[model samples]
Target: DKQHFKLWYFQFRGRAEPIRLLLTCAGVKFEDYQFTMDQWPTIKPTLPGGRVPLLDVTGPDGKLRRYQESMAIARLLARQFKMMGETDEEYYLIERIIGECEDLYREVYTIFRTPQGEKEAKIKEFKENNGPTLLKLVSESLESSGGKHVAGNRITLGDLFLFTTLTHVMETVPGFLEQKFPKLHEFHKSLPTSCSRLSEYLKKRAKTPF
Candidate 1:
């Protein structure tokens, strides 16, 4: 029998999106719990690390467990779902891609929260400087790998990380993947068709808040 799983987070995709995508790909049935700003104040103290996006899982032994930190949770789930990759080399490459996604997020999101006056300058630097440079490397890697997946031939957590991050970038940076990185744009657009359930979930999820 499968163990019960529950995930808690804000009513947004944020960091939890990739985890949800991984679980969906693995066909794991888990409870998705969303909390509002008002609710978080009261709920934060009860969590293991005073954070959202926590996973409460029950093992096959029927023992309940708590897991915190999005990246750790993602890797754990990836290992369980066979999405980490086949060998140590593949796993290392996948982890590298995941790290790149994190770097990209920090670059884009930090500028997003900056003061309005200075934000555009940062965005300009990002677009003119690191943006194309980093994306081109990722695009080249994808092209070399076969253009469908990132690290391994099979779909892995790395793809999920990149896809979800691309969605966020698409929403924030103007003409990011579309006008700038064609290969990445193509990869982003093609992700839905890569998996039936993921495609269905994207269509249904589009109507939600995040």
Candidate 2:
């Protein structure tokens, strides 16, 4: 019998998106459990640490196991789904790539948490400096990795992370990639089109706000 898998997250994409992309790309069937803001307050205390993006799966031993922390869940699934890497060296490289994206995510959080009156200035500053620097590193990685993935010849967790990061930037800072980072723009574009599963999943969530 197949093990059952369920992922719980907020209605918005946020941290859970890369995990979704990885699962969708692999065509792995799982339950996507999303809740609205109104329901979160009541649901929060039930979680291990009052945080979400949790993973619940029936392990091979036929016992239910639950995992928390978005990146932890992502790494666990990446290994299970064969999206991490085949060897330690490749896995480390992929981790390095994911670390860079963690930096980018922190930057986005700064903008998100800032006061509205000061947000535009912060966005301008990111637009002029931090954003391009991180993107340049990713662009170089894609070039060095044969223009297909970040750390390996095939799709890996790093690729999924980059695609999701690009999606967040596009939603918040429209035209940022196409106008400033053409290589990354193309890289982002290639992911969905090249993978039919991803393309279909994206079409289903075309109007997603986050």
Candidate 3:
């Protein structure tokens, strides 16, 4: 029996976008559930741990199981879909990549969430300082790994995660990555062509503000 995902999140591309993107790229069937900010306070308490983006999964026997934490749900999907990794090395790399991306996300979030007057400067400074470092680190890792893919010859969650993060950063930070990390920029550009499904989705994908 097939299972369905009950994703509860806001309509915007907040925390749920990456999970949705991953599921879509993998051709998984899931319900894209949404809620308003006004609904969160009441609904949050109903959740297992006062959180949204909860997954209400029905088992083969139609047994309902509720899960919290968006990242946890994403991890569950990764395991189910083999996006976690195929090998020991790949698994370690995936974990490491996720950690790195998480840190990067936090850094950017700190800048963006700051007050308006300082937001631009802090973001710009962050990019100027860390942009090239990120590119160089990944570029060297890919180059030295002697593998076509980031974690391995096959595209893993790490690649998707990195691609999504870099794309968003480039969009929001503006000119921070392309120049500082030319090779990495090239890598990002190749992402669409590298995966046929990704390329196809990107073409028709509606543009986002952030």
Candidate 4:
């Protein structure tokens, strides 16, 4: 069945979506298993590391292996799926792109981690200070890497990582990109069409705030 090999995520959403993009874009037939609070208790004890994402696959000898971490899982898939990039030069920059996206996530997510009363300042400054501050960094760096793709002359994991992170940003702060960061705005708009399957899959997936 299509469920023979699987990648699973438990608890909250968002981080797992990038891996979902990679697997779908790469055209893997593996199952995307997102466990919910309603039925997740049973599976909680089953995760090898008791964490977020779990990758279950056969490495040989019919053995079952479960990999851990969000970025690590994505790096493995990007390398195996040939999405890492062409040269040693492109390779490290792909990592640069990924790490930059990681920084973007943590900064934007600052408000949500605190209580309602405590986070109002976080939200206001995310507007006046936090948002545009890092966004400028992201946009400025985009110019150095080339406008359309982040590495080399082709789409790499770096492109997808940037695309997906900007996409999530658009959720919390829609139309913000349209006003600034033209190169990145253009890249975010164009990257999805590179993989028709992922474009199709994006529509079918469920929506969440972040």
Candidate 5:
């Protein structure tokens, strides 16, 4: 019996985009529930945790399991799909990568959620300071695994996390990823083609303001 996912998020990518990327890359059957901004108010109290990116899953035993938190959801998926290794060392490596991705995401997040009057300056300051440092940290992590994947030479949740965050970074500041970080730029570019399912989905994916 196959399982399924019902991911609820707003129309824009928001925080759920990486999970969406994870689902697409893993080639799982899922419903992409993109609610409009207007719908959030009515939908908010009805949701399990009053948050977007809530993953409602149904398993083989016909059990309904609800999930909260993005990285936790990602970790659960890796275990479900056997993407991570059976050994302890691999877990540490992958988790570490996720932490780094979180750091980068936090720094870049301000670009999106900040006020309109300060957006350009916040983005520029990020480009010159925190952005490059975190980018360099992740770039070095990619090199640790031979510059192909984020962890152990194969695509992991970390890579997908990095992709979504960097995609935001690139979108916020046009040409920044390509300009300052070549390795990461390559990683971002290669992501669409790396998984045929995700690539095709991206071709038709909703173009949101995010």
Candidate 6:
């Protein structure tokens, strides 16, 4: 029998979709398991770290090794697919790309995922203040990237990270990149057009599926 893995997530593209996309693009086989909101709190504690996106990698003993953190799994998949880097320089660049995205995610999580009552106003304020700044930085970085990739001329894991993040951002914040970051807007439109897998994935994604 083939090795089996279980991925836990809610009915949305919160934490697990990127991994799904990566696995799908690589033609890897695994069960895309989803759970309900009520089921998560109950199921979470059974996990090693009480996390949702636990990659239950089945062992030969019929045991499951729950891998915590979605980023770790995403990185593992990237390395497995050789998208992390082919060279030392690319690896360093890929790290930098992900690091930068971490900063962006921090800002996003603070704004969108906060317990603040006025989330709409706060998100609006974040976009008005910080969104363009991030876009400008990304745009400037893209200009130096040389071609259709984020790190140098090759499509590394960095490119996929950016692609996935951009996809999420645009969906969450209406006209977030398109209205503020035109180059990023162009990059968003242009990059996926060349990669059939990503292109089709985005095309088939249900709007507001979250």
Better of 3 and 4 by lDDT: 4
Give candidate 3 regions above 4 Å deviation. 146-148, 200-210
What local distance difference test score does each model get? 0.83, 0.83, 0.71, 0.75, 0.80, 0.71
Ten-residue region with minimum lDDT total, candidate 3? 141-150
Q: List the candidates' TM-scores in order.
A: 0.92, 0.92, 0.84, 0.88, 0.92, 0.83
User: What's the TM for model 2?
Assistant: 0.92
Which window of 10 residues has the lowest lDDT sum in candidate 5?
82-91
**Which should have the higher lDDT, number 2 or number 4?**
2
Candidate 6 residue 32 C-alpha distance from true site, Å: 1.1
Give the range where candidate 2 is weakest over 10 consecutive residues by summed lDDT. 201-210
**Candidates in descending lDDT order:** 2, 1, 5, 4, 6, 3
Badly placed stretches (over 4 Å) of model 6 are: 59-64, 114-117, 152-154, 206-210
Cα displacement (Å) at residue 56, model 3: 2.2
Task: Give the backbone clash total of model 1.
Answer: 0
Off by over 4 Å in 5: none
lDDT string for model 2 (1-210, tens) is 668889998987888888888888888898999988999999998988889898898877889998998888888889888889988877877887788788888888778778889989989998999999987887776787777777666788888898888877776677888898888888888887667898888888835556
User: Clash number for every model?
Assistant: 0, 0, 0, 0, 0, 0
How close is each model in CA RMSD to the real structure? 1.8, 1.7, 2.5, 2.4, 1.8, 2.8
Q: Write the per-residue lDDT of candidate 5 for residues 157-178, one digit (tens) a residue.
A: 7777778877877888789888
lDDT per residue (tens digit) for residues 1-210 in model 4: 223457787534567877878887787777778777777778778777677787787654677778888778888888988889878988977877777788878866665565778776776676677678777877766778877777877666787778888886775556767776666788777777777787798777776555
